[PDB]
RNA sequence: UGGAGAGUUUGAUCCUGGCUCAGGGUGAACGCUGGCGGCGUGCCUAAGACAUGCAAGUCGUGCGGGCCGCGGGGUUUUACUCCGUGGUCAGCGGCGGACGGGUGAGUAACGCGUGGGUGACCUACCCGGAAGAGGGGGACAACCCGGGGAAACUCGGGCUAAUCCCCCAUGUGGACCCGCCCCUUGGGGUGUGUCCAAAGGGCUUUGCCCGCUUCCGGAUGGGCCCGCGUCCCAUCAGCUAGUUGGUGGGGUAAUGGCCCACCAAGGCGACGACGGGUAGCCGGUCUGAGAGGAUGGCCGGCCACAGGGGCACUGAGACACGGGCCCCACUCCUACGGGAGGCAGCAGUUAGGAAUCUUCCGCAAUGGGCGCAAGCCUGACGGAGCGACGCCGCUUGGAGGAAGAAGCCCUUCGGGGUGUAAACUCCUGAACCCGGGACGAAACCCCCGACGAGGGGACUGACGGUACCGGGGUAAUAGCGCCGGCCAACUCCGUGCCAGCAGCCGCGGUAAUACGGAGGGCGCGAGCGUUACCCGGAUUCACUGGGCGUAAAGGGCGUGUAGGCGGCCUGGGGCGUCCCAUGUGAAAGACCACGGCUCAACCGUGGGGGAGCGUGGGAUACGCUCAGGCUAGACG
């Protein structure tokens, strides 16, 4: 007895699953990179941080991880990685981090 | 978007419109940004349509969109005339 | 309402001869020329000293019944006059005299103000060419009060304007008898009206 | 223009924070008497530079914490413990009226 | 351009003092009465419960289909299949559903008002500017097959398109880490490193249109923060554990104790915390000479809410009235396993109540959404209907008409009154009856031009055969309250402290201007009264503007805390105070003028305003503060 605006609801569900996935990836990768920064493995750490930043910006392309908020996540990731490698040294791969 | 449209201010069977700049999302008799003219459809007085041309040109320059009736009334006041 | 009913009983009650029938208030038949006491069973009895409220109420009722204006319009006109700048009483009188029915009476088109009211209401009077049928219409200085061309053949208008030949009009009015028209030249001053009313008494009556 | 008040530091017992008491005179809205009211503001002292009794200027600032919305602009005059003593006696009188 | 008082304590008086009345107002209700129209207005109670219909959709110029039908092809026929086309149906996809509309529950709060801050922020569509769109890949519906369920609906398998999703490239540019410079909270620039772009469709078809991507700016809308203002009770005096702060994090577009770890012990309060009660707030509105009091309905702004409570998803934007989830109460279906629902949208039903409307017409106008457009949707809106609920206009006749009919009421029995009132005479013509008959409506669109400017053309009226105009044309609703004083209006009879009246003083127990009726009179009039409520008078919470010896009121006395108040002279500052300039003070309303409906109510245009607050500059007499000095107060 209702109107077909239920269609909107359906779409949201799809979009929901689309978003939760991307974020769930980003978070995961971030953690991974930070681990390698704590253990001193700088090459792999930066190599994974590059992919994390890429996934962040790709999520920002759509309505999932829009706005800056994406820049916020990128900033926090790069800061934490550079800080943890400074506790060990030798930024081997020279990836996302500026000279 | 911001639009240039008419607001109804006369009484019943006595319509009087204010040509007005307002946000489209607001009610037609609600808080507008600026009154840029007035319009009397029944032609009761010899001055039944007045428009501030420079102000209308400004609001069109900044990105306002008039209604078909509003655009007609403006065109009658030479807002778009470039002769 | 219009109080419609006996009128010369007001000629009697107000103690001053009013002119509500036009004629017959000039003829020795007004019942004021022969019975100056107020109406009722207790009219010929010795009157007691009236209170101040009695005096002011009687004066206001006199001035109001002279024009035949209801209490609503009367109080409205008075408040309008008190809002304006100037003497409240003279402005109130100028407003009352500016009514279309009163102007028709003053211009001699009708013998009484109520006959003038009927002449206006039935569309027999025009203002600046356009027909006007509202007694409460306010005449502005310069307005031409004429008789409808379709009504200029009526017997009563013929009689009234045939009697107006040679009669003078108020200093604030002009009259053309052949064309059956006239002009409201200006607002009448207090010195132009010979009404038996003290305006300050009415001002004090509404001051309460 | 960001509001700039002037008051007395009456509490340095917090970390990087000072309680500045600010008075104000104004005619009474109905009785015309010039009355004197006061208000305590929690201001930001990121250097622990200001101490008790210091009369300081305070400036409207970006929120630092809940109830902390002001920064200490500059020092008007050094420690004058008289106003502090007045405030402390005003507070101490409250214990005498309980029951 | 503004200010009235009166009745009432006494045998009489002056005062004090309360009560009452005259005034104005209402989203009103009730009684009696009730003719017309215009404009407004109409659940104040149960934010109780709701049958039924409508109220939010729209795009085939994003994409592929199903069903029904037609036409033309490949074929000799059949089978099979291809193309075009019409209708219909949903689907995938985009935009809108966050606006508009309703309501006052809850909230004493940065909720609102006002003035500021954002170097701590966002903004779809819209406008301006710079640049770009290369190649490849994939999935889910529709649909086909099967299963489960009474139903709502649900599950599995398989095929497929795109402006759906993904990868690589191009890096105008932008994002981030780090460094430098300017600037000063996270603003702007610069370098290296790294990371990030896109979608096609339509034709009048190789040229345009609707779009797409990245970036800067505009515009609009909003988020957050701060100063000041915002009811009653102190028979609420102490409140606080995320409490106050810090550090580091999480989170958001963004600050924040918003949230979380760890550390410090703070934070608030008689300048009224906390608690209780009440209540959306304002522009304004009513009243008032003003100050002030009262109030927040209609209209406009902001807030909050969508049966009660909680929660996230999607999105530029929601913690989403007609979206989703869970708990509770309720109603309905039920194969008893489980489901469906949410008028404080329009109208209507029912309950409550003293009381509040039509289950109406229309997309013509204005406004909104989608669309290139045609157009579609719009219970927004424009209208009509009902209700003297309010305001305004108007009618129920006009003129003549007896020293005065009758009836009725008084009466000194002479007469007086109802009263020119009536009947009557002449006159106009409310209603009605005909005919004409609108403004509101010129744009979108089409044609020319260049899809621009400009010109031209055509369509479209719910109200409604309404308004209005012309002709014809009948004397044709009046009621309600009061008549002792305040307070305008008096006699007769009946009644006999009875029956009753009464706002206050008070009237009635035999001859009542007070009861009841009559005659007469007074006041208003399609109204008149009553009740309720607000302001008024009331200088009766006294800032303007009161008091305390005996009228209500000096604390039993002291010491003294906070607080209030502060002698004379000089100087510094300029906080109070004052001045100038400037910003702000939306519109509506209020005031003034002119104008439009024949007037008015109603409405339009223009004018003038204004405290407060922000900013810049200035003054220093007084109050303030600091420094110094004096001795008349005070102390020794
Ligand atoms: K005052
Ligand atoms: K304590
Ligand atoms: K007396
Ligand atoms: K399936
Ligand atoms: K670079
Ligand atoms: K919704
Ligand atoms: K054109
Ligand atoms: K006629
Ligand atoms: K006629
Ligand atoms: K009896
Ligand atoms: K009586
Ligand atoms: K005593
Ligand atoms: Mg839908
Ligand atoms: Mg849809
Ligand atoms: Mg994981
Ligand atoms: Mg989001
Ligand atoms: Mg809005
Ligand atoms: Mg013109
Ligand atoms: Mg132009
Ligand atoms: Mg006057
Ligand atoms: Mg006056
Ligand atoms: Mg101070
Ligand atoms: Mg400290
Ligand atoms: Mg902090
Ligand atoms: Mg003067
Ligand atoms: Mg003066
Ligand atoms: Mg008294
Ligand atoms: Mg006594
Ligand atoms: Mg006595
Ligand atoms: Mg005595
Ligand atoms: Mg009253
Ligand atoms: Mg009243
Ligand atoms: Mg009735
Ligand atoms: Mg009506
Ligand atoms: Mg209505
Ligand atoms: Mg209600
Ligand atoms: Mg109310
Ligand atoms: Mg398109
Ligand atoms: Mg075929
Ligand atoms: Mg062949
Ligand atoms: Mg065959
Ligand atoms: Mg089809
Ligand atoms: Mg479809
Ligand atoms: Mg489906
Ligand atoms: Mg709304
Ligand atoms: Mg409370
Ligand atoms: Mg409280
Ligand atoms: Mg504020
Ligand atoms: Mg507050
Ligand atoms: Mg503000
Ligand atoms: Mg976009
Ligand atoms: Mg652009
Ligand atoms: Mg493909
Ligand atoms: Mg494929
Ligand atoms: Mg495939
Ligand atoms: Mg298949
Ligand atoms: Mg499958
Ligand atoms: Mg570059
Ligand atoms: Mg790339
Ligand atoms: Mg895409
Ligand atoms: Mg592609
Ligand atoms: Mg081509
Ligand atoms: Mg907290
Ligand atoms: Mg923190
Ligand atoms: Mg942070
Ligand atoms: Mg968000
Ligand atoms: Mg607290
Ligand atoms: Mg305080
Ligand atoms: Mg409440
Ligand atoms: Mg007034
Ligand atoms: Mg006032
Ligand atoms: Mg209030
Ligand atoms: Mg409201
Ligand atoms: Mg409102
Ligand atoms: Mg309900
Ligand atoms: Mg619920
Ligand atoms: Mg709820
Ligand atoms: Mg969107
Ligand atoms: Mg909400
Ligand atoms: Mg919801
Ligand atoms: Mg609903
Ligand atoms: Mg459901
Ligand atoms: Mg009932
Ligand atoms: Mg209605
Ligand atoms: Mg309809
Ligand atoms: Mg429409
Ligand atoms: Mg339209
Ligand atoms: Mg309507
Ligand atoms: Mg009336
Ligand atoms: Mg007569
Ligand atoms: Mg006739
Ligand atoms: Mg026309
Ligand atoms: Mg159309
Ligand atoms: Mg062409
Ligand atoms: Mg044209
Ligand atoms: Mg029609
Ligand atoms: Mg006629
Ligand atoms: Mg009397
Ligand atoms: Mg009585
Ligand atoms: Mg009463
Ligand atoms: Mg007797
Ligand atoms: Mg008797
Ligand atoms: Mg009597
Ligand atoms: Mg009578
Ligand atoms: Mg009444
Ligand atoms: Mg009162
Ligand atoms: Mg008072
Ligand atoms: Mg007074
Ligand atoms: Mg009192
Ligand atoms: Mg006083
Ligand atoms: Mg006193
Ligand atoms: Mg004593
Ligand atoms: Mg002191
Ligand atoms: Mg002291
Ligand atoms: Mg002094
Ligand atoms: Mg002092
Ligand atoms: Mg000095
Ligand atoms: Mg100053
Ligand atoms: Mg204004
Ligand atoms: Mg006023
Ligand atoms: Mg006029
Ligand atoms: Mg001014
Ligand atoms: Mg200044
Ligand atoms: Mg000086
Ligand atoms: Mg000294
Ligand atoms: Mg001594
Ligand atoms: Zn007479």
Q: Where are the domains of chain A?
A: 1-99
Identify whether residues C102 and C186 lie together within a single domain: yes
The tokens 């829009």 sit on which residue?
A66
What is the distance between the alpha carbons of residues C185 and C172, in angstroms, rounded to a whole number? 5
Please name which of D7, D17, D4 lies closest in space to residue D47, comparing C-alpha atoms. Answer: D17
Measured distance between the N- and C-terminal CA atoms of chain B, rounded to whole angstroms: 29
Identify whether residues C83 and C159 lie together within a single domain: no
Which token pair is A87? 């506790």
What is the full DSSP assignment across chain B? -EEEEEEE-SBTTB--EEEEEEETTS-TTS--SEEEEEE-TT--SS--EEE-HHHHHHHHHHT-EE-HHHHHHHHHTTSS---
Which token pair is D67? 């109830």
Please name which of C94, C137, C144 lies closest in space to residue C117, comparing C-alpha atoms. Answer: C137
Domain formed by A1-99, architecture: Up-down Bundle (1.20)
For residue B79, what are the domain limits?
1-83
Identify whether residues C24 and C83 lie together within a single domain: yes
Q: Are A32 and A72 in contact (CB under 8 A)?
A: no
Q: Which residues have a Cβ under 8 Å from the Cβ of A17 and sit 6 or more positions away? A: none
What is the distance between the alpha carbons of residues D62 and A9, in angstroms, rounded to a whole number? 40
* Other beta carbons within 10 Å of C40: 11
* Other beta carbons within 10 Å of C84: 12
Q: Are D74 and D46 in contact (CB under 8 A)?
A: no
Q: Are D41 and D22 in contact (CB under 8 A)?
A: yes
What is the distance between the alpha carbons of residues C188 and C192, in angstroms, rounded to a whole number? 6
Residue A10 Cα, ligand 79 centroid: separation in angstroms? 22
* Other beta carbons within 10 Å of C115: 18
B40-49 contacts at long range (C-beta below 8 A, 24 or more positions apart):
B40/B16, B41/B15, B41/B17, B42/B14, B42/B15, B49/B73, B49/B76, B49/B77
What is the distance between the alpha carbons of residues A96 and A53, in angstroms, rounded to a whole number? 8
CA of C81 to C1' of E558 (A): 69
Q: Give a three-class secondary structure readout of chain D.
A: CCCEEEEEEEECCCCCEEEEEEEEEEECCCCCCEEEEEEEEEEECCCCCCCCCCEEEEEEEEEEECCEEEEEEEEEECCCHHHHHHHHHHHHHHHHCCC
Residue D90 Cα, ligand 116 centroid: separation in angstroms? 17
Provide the 3-class DSSP secondary structure of residue A29.
helix
What is the distance between the alpha carbons of residues C164 and C104, in angstroms, rounded to a whole number? 13
Q: Which residues have a Cβ under 8 Å from the Cβ of A80 and sit 6 or more positions away? A: A34, A37
What is the distance between the alpha carbons of residues A27 and C188, in angstroms, rounded to a whole number? 94
Please name which of D27, D10, D30 lies closest in space to residue D19, comparing C-alpha atoms. Answer: D10
Q: Which nucleotides of E are covered by protein (CB under 7 A)?
A: 1-2, 4, 22-23, 38-40, 56-57, 90-97, 99-101, 115-127, 165-168, 174-178, 185, 191-198, 214, 217-221, 224-229, 237-238, 244-247, 249-250, 252-258, 264-271, 292, 299-302, 313-317, 320, 322-324, 341-342, 365-369, 380-384, 392-404, 409-410, 416-421, 426-430, 439-444, 452-454, 469-471, 475, 478, 486-491, 519-526, 543, 561-565, 575-577, 586, 591-593, 595-600, 602-606, 614-616, 623
- Let me know the angle formed at the C-alpha of B3 by B7 and B14, rounded to the nearest 5 degrees: 15
Checking each nucleotide's C1' against the CA of B26, the nearest proves to be E99
For residue C176, what are the domain limits?
97-193
A25-A30-A36-A40 Cα dihedral, nearest 10 degrees: 160
Identify whether residues C149 and C134 lie together within a single domain: yes
Identify whether residues C103 and C159 lie together within a single domain: yes
Identify whether residues C84 and C140 lie together within a single domain: no
* Other beta carbons within 10 Å of A53: 21
What is the distance between the alpha carbons of residues B23 and B64, in angstroms, rounded to a whole number? 9
Residue A14 Cα, ligand 82 centroid: separation in angstroms? 19
Give the neighbours of chain D: at least 3 Cβ pairs within 8 Å.
Answer: none
What is the distance between the alpha carbons of residues A66 and A23, in angstroms, rounded to a whole number? 12
**Number of domains chain B contains:** 1
Q: Are strands C125-127 and C144-147 parallel, antiparallel or unpaired?
A: antiparallel
CA of A59 to C1' of E213 (A): 16
Q: Are D44 and D70 in contact (CB under 8 A)?
A: yes
DSSP category for residue A30 = H
Q: Give a three-class secondary structure readout of chain C.
A: CCCCCCCHHHHHHCCCCCCCCCCCCCCCCCCCCCCCCCCCCCCCCCCCCCCHHHHHHHHHHHHHHHHCCCHHHHHHHHHHHHHCCCCHHHHHHHHHHCEHHHHHHHCCCCCCHHHHHHHHHCCCEEECCEECCCCCCECCCCCEEEECCCCCCCHHHHHHHHHCCCCCCCCCEEEECCCCEEEECCCCCHHHCCCCCCHHHHHHHHHC
Task: Report how this structure was experimentally obtained.
Answer: X-ray
Query: Which chain C residues in 24-83 sit with Cβ < 7 A of strand E?
Result: 24-25, 27, 29, 31, 34-35, 38-45, 48, 50-54, 56-58, 61, 70-73, 76, 82-83
Q: Are A4 and A37 in contact (CB under 8 A)?
A: no
**Number of domains chain C contains:** 2
Measured distance between the N- and C-terminal CA atoms of chain C, rounded to whole angstroms: 26
* Other beta carbons within 10 Å of D5: 18
Residue B12 Cα, ligand 34 centroid: separation in angstroms? 11
The tokens 């309402």 sit on which residue?
C1
Please name which of C117, C101, C111, C103 lies closest in space to residue C24, comparing C-alpha atoms. Answer: C111
Which token pair is C141? 């200085």
Identify whether residues C92 and C5 lie together within a single domain: yes
Task: Give buried/exposed letters for A70-80 (b at 16+ CB in 10 A, else e).
Answer: beebbeebbeb
């Amino acid at each position: 007895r209702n109107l077909s605006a239920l269609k909107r609801h359906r779409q949201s569900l799809k979009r929901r699953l689309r978003n939760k996935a991307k974020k769930s990836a980003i978070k995961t990768l971030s953690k991974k990179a930070i681990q390698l920064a704590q253990e001193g493995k700088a090459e792999e750490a930066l190599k994974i941080m590059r992919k994390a930043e890429s996934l962040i910006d790709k999520a920002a392309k759509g309505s999932t991880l829009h706005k800056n908020a994406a820049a916020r996540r990128k900033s926090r990731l790069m800061r934490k990685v550079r800080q943890l490698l400074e506790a060990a040294g030798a930024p081997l791969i020279g990836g996302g981090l500026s000279a | 978007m911001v639009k240039i449209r008419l607001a109804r201010f006369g009484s019943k069977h006595n319509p009087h419109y204010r040509i007005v700049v307002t946000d489209a999302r607001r009610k037609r008799d609600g808080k507008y940004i600026e009154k840029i003219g007035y319009y009397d459809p029944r032609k009761t007085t010899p001055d039944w349509l007045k428009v501030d041309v420079e102000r209308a040109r400004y609001w069109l320059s900044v990105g306002a969109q008039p209604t078909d009736t509003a655009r007609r009334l403006l065109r009658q006041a030479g807002v778009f005339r470039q002769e | 309402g219009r109080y419609i009913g006996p009128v010369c009983r007001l000629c009697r009650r107000e103690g001053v001869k009013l002119y509500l029938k036009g004629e017959r208030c000039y003829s020795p038949k007004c019942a004021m020329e022969r019975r100056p006491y107020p109406p009722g069973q207790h009219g010929q009895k010795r009157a007691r000293r009236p209170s101040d409220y009695a005096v002011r109420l009687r004066e206001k009722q006199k001035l109001r019944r002279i024009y035949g204006i209801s209490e609503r319009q009367f109080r409205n006109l008075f408040e309008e006059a008190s809002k304006k700048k100037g003497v409240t009483g003279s402005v109130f009188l100028g407003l009352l005299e500016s009514r279309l029915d009163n102007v028709v009476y003053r211009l001699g088109f009708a013998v009484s103000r109520r006959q003038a009211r009927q002449l206006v209401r039935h569309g027999h009077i025009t203002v600046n060419g356009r027909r006007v049928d509202l007694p409460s219409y306010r005449v502005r200085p310069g307005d031409e009060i004429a008789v409808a061309e379709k009504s200029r053949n009526l017997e009563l208008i013929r009689q009234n304007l045939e009697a107006m030949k040679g009669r003078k009009v108020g200093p604030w009015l002009s009259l053309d008898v052949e064309g059956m028209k006239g002009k409201f030249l200006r607002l009448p001053d207090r010195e132009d009206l010979a009404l038996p009313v003290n305006e300050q008494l009415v001002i004090e009556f509404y001051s309460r | 223009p960001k509001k700039v008040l002037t008051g007395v530091v009456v509490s340095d017992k917090m970390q990087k924070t000072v309680t500045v008491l600010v008075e104000r005179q104004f005619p009474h809205p109905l009785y015309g008497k010039v009355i004197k009211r006061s208000k305590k503001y929690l201001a930001h002292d990121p250097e622990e530079k200001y101490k008790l009794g210091d009369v300081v200027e305070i400036i409207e600032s970006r929120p630092i914490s809940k109830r902390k919305r002001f920064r200490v602009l500059r020092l008007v005059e050094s420690g004058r413990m008289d106003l502090v003593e007045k405030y402390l006696i005003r507070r101490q009188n409250y214990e005498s009226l309980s029951k």
